[PDB]
A paper describes a structure:
VPS13 family proteins are thought to mediate directional bulk glycerolipid transfer between organelles at contact sites, where organelles are closely apposed, effecting membrane expansion and organelle biogenesis. In yeast, Vps13p localizes to multiple contact sites in part via the so-called VPS13 adaptor binding domain (VAB), near the C-terminal end. The VAB, with no significant sequence similarity to any previously characterized protein domain, interacts with a Proline-X-Proline (Pro-X-Pro) motif present in receptor proteins at contact sites. Receptor proteins include the sorting nexin Ypt35p on the endosome, Spo71p on the prospore membrane, and a multipass integral membrane protein, Mcp1p, in the outer mitochondrial membrane.
Author numbering:
A (entry chain A): 3 to 12, 20 to 37, 53 to 69, 84 to 404, 413 to 560, 568 to 593
B (entry chain B): 21 to 35, 56 to 68, 86 to 113, 125 to 228, 232 to 250, 253 to 389, 396 to 401, 414 to 611, ...
Amino acid sequence: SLVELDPAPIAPYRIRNYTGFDVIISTKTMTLRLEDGQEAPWSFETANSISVQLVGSGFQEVKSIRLTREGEFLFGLKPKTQQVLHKLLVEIKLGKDNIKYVTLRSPLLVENDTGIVVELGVYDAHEGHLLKIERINPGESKPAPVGAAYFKSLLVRPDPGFKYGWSSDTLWWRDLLKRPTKTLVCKSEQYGGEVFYFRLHARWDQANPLTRNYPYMRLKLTAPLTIENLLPYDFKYKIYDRVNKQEWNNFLRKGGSIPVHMVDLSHTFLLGIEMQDTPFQASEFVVINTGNADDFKKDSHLVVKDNAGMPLNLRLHYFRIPDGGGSFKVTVYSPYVILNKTGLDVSVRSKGFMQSARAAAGQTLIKARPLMFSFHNDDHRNRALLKAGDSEWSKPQSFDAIGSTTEVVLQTANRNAEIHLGVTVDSGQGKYKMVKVVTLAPRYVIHNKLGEDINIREPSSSFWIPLKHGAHRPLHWLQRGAVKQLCLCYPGVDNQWTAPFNISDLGITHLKIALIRVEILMEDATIFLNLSMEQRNWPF
Amino acid sequence: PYRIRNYTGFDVIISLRLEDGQEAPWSFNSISVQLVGSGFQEVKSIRLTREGEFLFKLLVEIKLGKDNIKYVTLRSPLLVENDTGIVVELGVYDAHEGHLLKIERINPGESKPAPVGAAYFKSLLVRPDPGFKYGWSSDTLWWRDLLKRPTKTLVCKSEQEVFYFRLHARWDQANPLTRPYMRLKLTAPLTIENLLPYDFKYKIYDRVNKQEWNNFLRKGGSIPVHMVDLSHTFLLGIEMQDTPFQASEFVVINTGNADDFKKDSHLVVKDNAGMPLNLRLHYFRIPDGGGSFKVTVYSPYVILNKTGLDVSVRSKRAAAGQARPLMFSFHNDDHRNRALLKAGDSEWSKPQSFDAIGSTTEVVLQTANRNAEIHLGVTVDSGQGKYKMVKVVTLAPRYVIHNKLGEDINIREPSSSFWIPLKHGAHRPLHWLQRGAVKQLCLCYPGVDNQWTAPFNISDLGITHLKIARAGQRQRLIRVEILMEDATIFLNLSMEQRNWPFSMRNESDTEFTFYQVNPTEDRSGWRPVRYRLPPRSIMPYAWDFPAAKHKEICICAYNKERHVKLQEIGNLMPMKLALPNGESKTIDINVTADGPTQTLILSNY
């Protein structure tokens, strides 16, 4: 056999060298030589401190670097030339893997918060020469070389394959102390009009005085615009710059987000969408960013008209990227999404407070597409009306109550049956938190697990309907009464119907047929009836 | 399968000799009835297969009862129904000689006929039970007078106090035997029903026959009144015991013939502070009663405070008479009227509907000067059975936790340093919660140097397993059952007395180590917990962090790692390990499904 055990449970450092020089790290016995850009694990087999010497830098070996606390600790490189005090920054981050990541670098950091590879170049602006160039992956950061961050300037460009040149201005920390926020312009090598845009924000602690004497900054590079699609459909979008009059076309799936590097935030630019697979036309342009010269208020809504002409008022959410220096995300969403899960084709109308009732835009027939829904204005007194099949229109229902289940009883046309629906209104899960999801369901659903086919009938009614084994079916039309009931029979002729059982009484109920267990359980405004053969002892 | 009731006023012979007033069974399909000493011939060819009223004047009533037996009452076509609650004596009166012939008792609910032959010539009189000491009816009950005036008040003076019946006579207008085929129903003139959640003492006043009448009525109770006449305008006044309400003013429950007072559809009670409550009065006319009716005092809303907090309700003024159930009304009857709730030290709520029949809503209350919220569940239903006109509004906690672990436990929201104790066998509402879309909880054994568990989502309905351990002790599995009753998510914490969902079975000659993969934003609380699986061993495992979306494990051997899932059946994808002696080993990985348990088998290839 095997040894049965109880389920009880059971290189702590990783050092990277981003200094621009080869380093030698020795404990205060064990040595590790690291090239520039390489990382290696580290363990201590004085206390828990190391000593770092930058090879070929002309700097003394920094002693007594304790690696136990986390944060950014600055050490003074000892041969000061002319009151220059160059600093080595040791950054320690305790990651989620319970491993302290240790970065040896200069205090100037460049953060790539874009989705593409960015090349950072070390530039001598007096000589016109690019000393070195390092690549930064998306979501990563790289520093200027140690020592060179004080004297040399910086340039950024995208990945060469994109054929965009270096930034037309430099990234100089003494200029960034007075002007930390800057749009970085990169001209194209294939089109004079084509111009890639970065947006740079520089940030530091305003209490540390060393940033007035040394580049102790972080330089975050972002996309100036990000477009998120939280509709339940895809769209093709069209960005128009009012200045110099360019238009850029692209595609965006449901749930997706895309960065744009083709617009500058000093220009007024506009968004237009054309939703795919939906009875709506292309939208008009809405102002998603104003310029420094223009004074347009940016649009909070986006109108799409269907093929009949009725409007749908989508909403635009703006989120400023933190530490981004004015770069933002725009999100197109529908304020309501109605899910028709009744099985019957459902018409939805919108009625205002003092306004009249109008039909909803883009209503199709069922297999049921999700229906984007908005009111004509943003009143809390606005309500909606529902119609299921050949039923009468509903009472005014509220789609604003977050986390609510409501029974809706519809009287029906030319008969005395009634349709019973369950309406759930929730907020969308995760990133769809600003979208109110309205599920329309039948209130009663019966499911057959008896092993064979069955016939069901409400006992105040001569109208019977079958139900196959393993098939679920809703119970739409019901006869009027306070308590709702049902009866079962086998499909053989001259078999007898059962006693009536209340289909709204939650719990288990036994029922003899010529023992059947009916369990009755509510789930998201829908009472589910489950029929089964009782495989236990009878209660009497 | 037959039962014959001889109510003819004579003795009959059925071909069974049945005397007058005696019932007897019968089987066999027709019979013949001889009325002995009546001066009539033998009625024969009496079919007993169909139900109804058949005339031969002689009447045979056949009723197919609940015990599917053929009830066969032989009678005259003049029947007196006792639909009152007391025993009624019926007398056969000869008004030309002042002469009472026979006296027949009628129990409540049943009916008794006039004698055959004497119905067409002699009049009738009713009275109550002679233990009540009330005389006969002052007027006579003559059916020719009832053919023109079918509805009357029957008055009975006391023998040392006036008793009243309401008589209505009904018949088929298309019957050819008009001018005595009729039914004479006797009802109480008034019935008062209490559908309040408190008892009251009531008092009936009247303008004519100035006579106050005081009595008591419990909750859910109904009482007939025989001391008033429907020709009199009379008034009802209630006073509820064990309430903070005072006595009510008199409202008009019956108008007279000569008066023009409107019948009050409402009844206002006032509390000890002066705030009003508008109870409603439902009137139900008794069918074929001749205008006798039932009045019903009910509250339009009953608010049940099941939260455990002190709750105030306002109506858009404050509610009157503010756990006992709270009767609630609005100032008027508009569907745009809403209410506001306050619970404890929280702000007032959004406008809530008490008219939304069959609804469960979640109400979130921002508390005063702190960033915690109170989460409530509001359920609005109609009452059960006879309470269907009352709207019942239950205020409940949104979340309730229940300890069935056997030991005491401590609970904590994972974004909070504030922990709450929880004794064994104790229900507790989770009122105050931190803000956020995903509400979570953590458990810990009491005492320091004990670690908290992984967070689990308390809004995800179903079964969730959670691993817990004391300091230096082994792990035990907690079953967390999360179920929604009605605006109340009950969390039940028990110790799992079932095999664990996973069994790591290392059949190979290689020591492994396994851990749950980092999902990364996340709210699983993932920390590194590695387990050692020595060669030829087995150990049950439950997810270390059940709040993760994608859940896989990572097995590790000789600085090699392999992610494997734990729900699929696997694909026997082997893992190649480079051993320090220079050779290579190959570990086959399979997942079998033993019922609810998924077993991971690592073998040698």
